[PDB]
Design a protein around this ligand. Structure first.
Ligand SMILES: OCc1cc(Br)ccn1
Length: 129
């Protein structure tokens, strides 16, 4: 896309260790699946396109961008070593939204609905086997 948007987060790197765990499988098959199909998921399914949205300060503020499209790719391509890495990516995505936007902005209410679902699912993250 535009040279004025940063490259997306890494989703492929042969030097990084990687493993399948039952917790990472749950994050794909239960958590990502549930959030992806939510009515309010669409703004979070790809990196923020700050050019198209006319937000030229976005990547001045948000220096740790993350989105569910990136997480989806990371889970499908087995990028992660453990569930904590993936959970941190979801938390980063939510907190970016809350940092950049005004409380009560539509995008914040949408993020909050996804986060409430997220928390319910993560409270049932299975014991690592
Ligand atoms: O206003 C910032 C923003 C825009 C979109 Br689309 C998704 C997440 N955050």
């Amino acid at each position: 896309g535009s040279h004025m948007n940063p490259p997306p987060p890494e989703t492929s790197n042969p030097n990084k260790p990687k493993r399948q765990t039952n917790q990472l499988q749950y994050l794909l098959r239960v958590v990502l699946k549930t959030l992806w199909k939510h009515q309010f998921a669409w703004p979070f399914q790809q990196p923020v396109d700050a050019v198209k949205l006319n937000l030229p300060d976005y990547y001045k503020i948000i220096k740790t961008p993350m989105d569910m499209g990136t997480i989806k790719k990371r889970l499908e391509n087995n990028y992660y070593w453990n569930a904590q890495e993936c959970i941190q990516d979801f938390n980063t995505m939510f907190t970016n939204c809350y940092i950049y936007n005004k409380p009560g902005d539509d995008i914040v209410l949408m993020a909050e609905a996804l986060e409430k679902l997220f928390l319910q699912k993560i409270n049932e993250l299975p014991t690592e086997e």
